[PDB]
Design a protein around this ligand. Structure first.
Ligand SMILES: Cc1cc2nc3c(=O)[nH]c(=O)nc-3n(C[C@H](O)[C@H](O)[C@H](O)COP(=O)(O)O)c2cc1C
Ligand SMILES: O=C(O)c1ccccc1N/N=C/c1ccc(-c2ccccc2Cl)o1
Ligand SMILES: CCCCCCCCCCC[N+](C)(C)[O-]
Ligand SMILES: O=C1C[C@@H](C(=O)O)NC(=O)N1
Length: 366
């Protein structure tokens, strides 16, 4: 625990970042993870951390966010890392390369990253076969409280966005415990305007119809993942459509195209989505707002700048049933997962909660 926590944070990771640019480090990390070349994950999840939501049991509330394992190559290594659930993607229907390099940038002074990957993806067919090869193993993992999510994107040249997502539902829906309709990527022109009302209702109506057409045992929950950069009108509209159509949950939030005042990193003006610490409270506030607009009736996965138990608990109290992290992993390495879980459990006891479930939305009941 604390030993290689400090070793990874003070020595290992800083040395990795000195040797490798962000995208190279990302690639290597995916390789190592898929091979199980990880530190020992000694933290044992207590019953306090268990959550039941989205039609599943989650043995702990800390997931790996979409974008790390884009093509489904490292899923088992990620469970080994200690994540209570794993989300792969975004996956696009056809293979595509994404934007030209460089397309990932570190802001060390801000504990932040900026990326404009642009949905680089092996495509549905490759990922489908990848997941099929471990399908029964995943079934046991899920039954064991370790669910799998799949994040669906759309091709850059795609003429019909709803049809791209419908394809993803048909191909990967049968292999996922939940699907994410990602209408919040900063890095595909036009995508985020799928977040407007009548266009979103049409989009999500088609997604849900395709989902309902799958056989029962293979029918995933469907979640919508939104940006932190929405107007009050956007959020209000999304909340309304989500409740009207019976969307199963929200993921809040993606990266931000904003650049908060105070960023110090030399690369702060690179185009792309900003993640990590500068995003943290913007994300938490968006969770707070969406939870209230949905009357606490729509499950929320909270994401954005989580690197400690306090960060996680603040999102849970704000209305998140589950949280994810990504950027924190790039700075502190695999030990950050056990760290977050251990601190979350301590804070829960400290504040008088019997478990995570009791803390969900607790700020709204004060
Ligand atoms: C390098 C990188 C790539 C990402 N790729 C995706 C993606 O493909 N699909 C998606 O829905 N979110 C993607 N994200 C967003 C993350 O899932 C997450 O919402 C965001 O980074 C905020 O969490 P964080 O501060 O813990 O990193 C990406 C983020 C980063 C840093
Ligand atoms: O480095 C970036 O700026 C970066 C940018 C974008 C995405 C990921 C990024 N780095 N990720 C590093 C990482 C992940 C996992 C491990 C790791 C470390 C040590 C042992 C085992 C493992 Cl799996 O290192
Ligand atoms: C199959 C068409 C080409 C898709 C390549 C997508 C990237 C695969 C490797 C992921 C890690 N990365 C390249 C982002 O550093
Ligand atoms: O959803 C996404 C897509 C990703 C990319 O550019 O591939 N970049 C992000 O920050 N969020």
């Amino acid at each position: 625990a604390t030993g290689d926590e400090r070793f990874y944070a003070e020595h290992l990771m800083p040395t990795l970042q000195g040797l490798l640019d962000p995208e190279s480090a990302h690639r290597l990390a995916v390789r190592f993870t898929s091979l199980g070349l990880l530190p020992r994950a000694r933290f044992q999840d207590s019953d306090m951390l268990e959550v039941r939501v989205l039609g599943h049991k989650f043995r702990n509330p800390v997931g790996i966010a979409a974008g790390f394992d884009k093509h489904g190559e490292a899923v088992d290594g990620l469970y080994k890392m200690g994540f209570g659930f794993v989300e792969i993607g975004s996956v696009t229907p056809k293979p595509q390369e994404g934007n030209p390099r460089p397309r990932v940038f570190r802001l060390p002074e801000d504990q932040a990253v900026i990326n404009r990957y642009g949905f680089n993806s092996h495509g549905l067919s490759v990922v489908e076969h990848r997941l099929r090869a471990r399908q029964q193993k995943q079934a046991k993992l899920t039954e064991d409280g370790l669910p799998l999510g799949v994040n669906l994107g759309k091709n850059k040249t795609s003429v019909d966005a709803a049809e791209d997502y419908a394809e993803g539902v048909r191909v990967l829906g049968p292999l996922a415990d939940y699907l994410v309709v990602n209408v919040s990527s900063p890095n595909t022109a036009g995508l985020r305007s799928l977040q407007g009302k009548a266009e979103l209702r049409r989009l999500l109506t088609k997604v849900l119809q395709e989902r309902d057409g799958l056989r029962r045992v293979h029918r995933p929950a469907v979640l919508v993942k939104i940006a932190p950069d929405l107007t009050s009108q956007d959020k209000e509209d999304i909340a309304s459509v989500v409740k009207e159509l019976g969307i199963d949950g929200l993921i809040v939030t993606n990266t931000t195209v904003s650049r908060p005042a105070g960023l110090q990193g030399a690369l702060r003006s690179e185009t792309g989505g900003l993640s990590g610490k500068p995003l943290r409270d913007l994300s938490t506030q968006t969770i707070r707002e969406m939870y209230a607009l949905t009357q606490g009736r729509v499950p929320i996965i909270g994401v954005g700048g989580v690197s400690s138990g306090q960060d996680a608990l603040e999102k849970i109290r704000a209305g998140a049933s589950l949280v994810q992290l990504y950027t924190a992993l790039t700075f502190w390495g695999p030990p950050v997962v056990g760290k977050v879980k251990r601190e979350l459990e301590a804070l829960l006891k400290e504040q008088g909660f019997g478990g995570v479930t009791d803390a969900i939305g607790a700020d709204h009941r004060r």
